[PDB]
Amino acid sequence: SAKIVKPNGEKPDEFESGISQALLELEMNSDLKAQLRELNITAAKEIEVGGGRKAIIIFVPVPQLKSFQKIQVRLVRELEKKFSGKHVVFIAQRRILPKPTRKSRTKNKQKRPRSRTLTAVHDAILEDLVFPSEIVGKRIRVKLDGSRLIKVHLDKAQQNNVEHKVETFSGVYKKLTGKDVNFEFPEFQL
Amino acid sequence: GRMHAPGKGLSQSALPYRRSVPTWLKLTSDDVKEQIYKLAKKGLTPSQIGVILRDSHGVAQVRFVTGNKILRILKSKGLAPDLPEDLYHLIKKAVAVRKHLERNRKDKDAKFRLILIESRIHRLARYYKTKRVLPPNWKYESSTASALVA
Amino acid sequence: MPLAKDLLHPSPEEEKRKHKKKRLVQSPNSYFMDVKCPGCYKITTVFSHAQTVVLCVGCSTVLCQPTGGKARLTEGCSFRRKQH
Amino acid sequence: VRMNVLADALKSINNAEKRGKRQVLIRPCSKVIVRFLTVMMKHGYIGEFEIIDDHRAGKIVVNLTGRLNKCGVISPRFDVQLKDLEKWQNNLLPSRQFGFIVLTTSAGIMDHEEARRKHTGGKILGFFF
Amino acid sequence: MADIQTERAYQKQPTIFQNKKRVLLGETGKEKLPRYYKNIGLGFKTPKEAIEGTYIDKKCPFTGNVSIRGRILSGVVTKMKMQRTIVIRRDYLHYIRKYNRFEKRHKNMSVHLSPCFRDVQIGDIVTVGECRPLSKTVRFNVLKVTKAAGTKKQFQKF
RNA sequence: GCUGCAGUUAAAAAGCUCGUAGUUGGAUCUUGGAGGGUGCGCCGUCCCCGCCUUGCCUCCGAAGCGUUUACUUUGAAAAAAU
């Protein structure tokens, strides 16, 4: 119920409950169970796409992700179908640590890991938002109006799973960072 | 460009972007770490392990299929040897040049070259020492160097 | 240099002619392949330029010799690239 | 080798505009290059720029109009004392009226006008007009 | 430890008296030496060694008769050749306008070092405090040993 | 000749390289409406400020208290004559 899988320091509910139930629904089965069972989730958040189909974002412990990666496509396919009208995906909760000041104080708290920096984390978010494709490259555009836009290049193959999504990834990303993201396709070295 | 000559030559790896992959790469961390350790048993250097792994068996970079550089893998198993390999091959090279110069006292080129090599060694050791790898007070000496490299 | 290129989107053809280090954003110019030799049926992955002898799984065979550059594959052999 | 990276970016720009060029690719970029490119941008001296992400140190493409006579870098990064800023802008700016000295202060990389208004000071990066 | 007392004169803290006495256990009494100490002030913790110790050192800021007043300085330990005293090197920046770059410059400062501090080893950064003339050269006394195994160039342990 | 010099031929790059001191050193770790000064005749113009992750902890003050600095900023302390 709420207790097990919606935990991570808060019980709660509603959607988390629905999705969890959906996972159980999937759980009845074969190899489409036992493999999942281990997987667990911290929380779910829902945020929309501009005309109005919402996207559902799921949070993972991070040690878990390799396994989630293991399934992903098949699971997402199920969650989109059972829960339709939403774009489902998977993001790992990452900690982020503040850069020390100085007088922040500083009781030289244990170093911290780049694998804890806000930029690194955000990069991870970008990496997580798209899936099996791969981010081929990136560029940053400085708009006349002091604005910045990040062009995130994408692979080509197998993309289709993401193609329809793109707009949500942009919106979702915004909700998290407040930065603007855009997507593109390549090229194929020759 | 270059340190002990006027050579310009740009030349390199050119390492790949793609964050992940290879994808056509199955195997596993398990697999190649075993592979690495077994090769290092045989006496192979990390450069050498990386090459042979690269060409014979699928490993584009050992880093990517395992979050660790080959040397770090070796050291963690307990395969790290006494001085870093670059320093080794330098010391060994200055040895072979030194042996050749003892044979042929008439070769001024060789004497020049020996100096160059030796300077490169002393600076490298200064760097390793600054960085704990070598005990502060480490030095390379002709006398003892011969005995050191083998 | 006539005050005309889109340094940001350069052409794939003239990007493909340039040095690996001179490429817009860098990238290599080398690849991997699967290699055959009828007697066996399984397939060894090989690196385009190779230095090492590469021998097959079992048969002391051959499977290219090295050179200045790309390994020269040996006589009666076949090879799909290839991935991403 | 390299001591600074800014000086290269700035020079590269200046030679682009001198040729009659409308774009450049600078390498390798840095937070400081971005910040400087940005101050330039706010003021009009360049168009829009783009940081391309090699898995290395970066490469920037700047699209430039042609309002730029010169963007220089001051090395070393001398300390300036609020009434050495008045002395700097006079040394290296065309008329009292325009052109900016851009420095780095505790409270941000800024053009000296913004410096005067905040009322902070620091070490001098460079300039343009 | 090493027998302190070593010299020819009986080392003692002034006006801190004894009197051992008869009856059983101890025997006399167990500590056998009353010890007097004080905190320097300025929030410098008086290290345990001072309180725990047998050593005499009049010159000690914690155990001895010296007051710390005046400049509080920090420097890097260049020498620990002399007994109970060290030499520290103080780097400072000299500003030259006439055209403007100033050039690193340094001064060495002799400073007394209480036996309470140990591992005073060259390389260690140390915080010394001004004091009454201890010796013709020495104006200062080591108040705090800043330390660090860090500076990694080796790996310190505990 | 710092600002602000010249050194192919005018006065001036050591025959060449190694090299300690000294100097000099790549990218990369925080983000995404009104208060106060002086001009112009109740109106406004133009700075400056907290805003539309930002010292932790001890448990408002106090205290703990600073990771070190340089830097720069705001104060005091700053002989009169000049």
Coordinates of C-alpha atoms (C1' of nucleotides) in Angstrom, one line a residue, chain A residues 103-107 109, chain F residues 53-58 62-66:
Chain A
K103 CA 31.5 32.2 6.2
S104 CA 28.9 29.6 4.9
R105 CA 30.4 29.1 7.6
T106 CA 32.6 26.3 6.8
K107 CA 33.5 23.6 9.7
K109 CA 32.4 19.9 6.2
Chain F
rU53 C1' 20.4 27.6 -2.6
rU54 C1' 22.2 32.1 0.1
rG55 C1' 26.4 31.2 7.6
rC56 C1' 25.8 26.5 9.8
rC57 C1' 25.4 24.7 14.8
rU58 C1' 24.7 25.4 19.6
rA62 C1' 23.9 35.1 23.7
rA63 C1' 27.0 31.7 22.5
rG64 C1' 29.6 28.2 19.8
rC65 C1' 33.1 31.3 15.7
rG66 C1' 35.1 31.0 12.2

